[PDB]
Amino acid sequence: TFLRWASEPEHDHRKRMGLKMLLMMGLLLPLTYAMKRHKWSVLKSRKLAYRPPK
Amino acid sequence: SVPETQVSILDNGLRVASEQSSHATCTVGVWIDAGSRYETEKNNGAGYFLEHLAFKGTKNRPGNALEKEVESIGAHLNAYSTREHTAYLIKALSKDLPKVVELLADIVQNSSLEDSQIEKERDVILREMQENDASMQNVVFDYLHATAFQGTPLAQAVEGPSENVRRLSRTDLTDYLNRHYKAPRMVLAAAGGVEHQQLLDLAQKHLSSVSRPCRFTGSEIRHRDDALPLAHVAIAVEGPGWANPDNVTLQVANAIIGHYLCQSFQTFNISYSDTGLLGAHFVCDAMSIDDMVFFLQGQWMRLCTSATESEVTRGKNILRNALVSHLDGTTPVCEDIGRSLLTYGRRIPLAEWESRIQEVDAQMLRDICSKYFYDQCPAVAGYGPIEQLPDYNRIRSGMFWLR
């Protein structure tokens, strides 16, 4: 355990950063996905129709 | 001291209004609260096709002998149909006032729809529609109505789809006639050299027999046809309606907007019963398309944010000078009178219009413009080479400013 600590004194600090990163990404990924799906809904609902004058 | 429009509704419900003027020529019309908004997609061209059939003879005056009568006094006979109102009006002399009223009585009741004529007027209507497509601005405004009022009876056109036109019969027409021609929904309007008591007596003599959720939708419709030389684009937002007074303020704003870039700018405030379309219909070359827009949207946001007193005063003067719409001419006034009684239920005098104009200042103009233009979803209708016409996100983002 000590040698491990030696080889990475920041082990603890990092894991705290990783926990904050997972919480922030769990907050931010569905919200950015919702913004993308808002701004892409317009097209994803676009209905095309071909009306040759005939 | 505006000449008052004396009104005399009948027990049947026929409001009879008239305004007297020096003109020895008088215009008399019948307004009916019946348009394409009252049609239920199975009779989508009934009002238009009845408007074609209404001058082709009645029971008492069979065929062209009827129009021979309106040639005999030298009178002019006109009719029109909108999405909410139908009008049958005659411009004549003053001394021919009784017979004209009698003629109008036949046109609203006792009318005769000949089966022979029905086929002939179907070919007329069909052909006109088959060539109506030629008029672009009509195509663009119909597209704007369709995409703004999808799923409602306000999307469907006055003419209707060729389908219905072909598939229509006397009985159907008879229904529309017998259903939407009720006496309480009718105004007999007269303007010019007419006496109100004589007109009331004539309405009592004839015409005394007449029987007794609107939603806007923001959507991008784009009819691309690159062979056309010019492009017509209309952008609108939801209007307030007939009875909402800030229409007056919006009219001033429309005035202030005026028309400054690519040619063919314009502005409209079309009003229906508690709804409407307020916007602009420009028409232009491939490149100007966007900028004009960009241009146009900037002006709207300026009216939402930075309206000054000088342009408000200019718009008020332009609107007042626009009261000339009322003017004194028999036809225009009569027409105005016709709507007044159908929409407001009364004739608003020009002094009340002047009071509502002079109470408008810059602060309430930018307040009402922010209420109706800022951060609103518009309806867009384009026809022609409209590839450089921006799609809905760019127009929607141009409907507000980040500053």
Nearest chain B residue to A39 by CA distance is B393
The alpha carbons of chain A give a radius of gyration, in whole angstroms, of 24
List beta partners, residue B281: B234
Query: Do residues B286 and B231 lie in contact, with contact meaning Cβ atoms separated by under 8 Å?
Result: yes
- Give the method used: cryo-EM
**For residue B35, which of B333, B273, B340 has the smallest C-alpha distance?**
B273
Partners of B392 on chain A (C-beta within 8 Å) are 42
Mutation site for B-interface testing, chosen from A37, A42, A50 by largest number of B Cβ within 10 Å: A42
Q: How far is CA B51 from the centre of its chain?
A: 15
- The reply to whether residue A39 touches residue B391, judged by beta carbons under 8 angstroms, is no
Q: Give the sheet arrangement for strand B186-192, strand by strand.
A: B6-7, B14-20, B186-192, B25-32, B86-93, B76-81
List beta partners, residue B169: none
Is residue B119 flagged as an active site residue?
Answer: no
Nearest chain A residue to B133 by CA distance is A53
- The reply to whether residue B220 touches residue A39, judged by beta carbons under 8 angstroms, is no
| Alpha-helical segments (H) within B85-229 | 97-108, 115-132, 136-148, 162-166, 170-180, 196-205
Spatial separation of the C-alpha atoms in residues B126 and B132, rounded to whole Å: 9
What SS3 state is found at B118? helix
Residues 21-50 of A with CB under 8 A from B: 39, 42-43, 46
Query: Do residues B28 and B101 lie in contact, with contact meaning Cβ atoms separated by under 8 Å?
Result: yes
Partners of A46 on chain B (C-beta within 8 Å) are 220
Instruction: Write out the DSSP string of B38-75.
Output: G--SSSTTHHHHHHHHTTS-BSSS-TTHHHHHHHHTT-
Q: How far is CA A40 from the centre of its chain?
A: 17
Partners of B393 on chain A (C-beta within 8 Å) are 39, 42
Residues 356-395 of B with CB under 8 A from A: 391-393
Spatial separation of the C-alpha atoms in residues B190 and B174, rounded to whole Å: 27
Q: How many CA atoms lie within 13 A of B139 on its CB side?
A: 20
Please give the sequence-ordered ranges of beta strands (E in DSSP) within chain A, or none if there are none: none
Nearest chain B residue to A49 by CA distance is B223
From B19, B39, B51, B159, active-site residue: B51
Please give the sequence-ordered ranges of beta strands (E in DSSP) within B141-274, or none if there are none: 186-192, 220-224, 231-238, 268-272
Matching residue, tokens 């060539």: B131
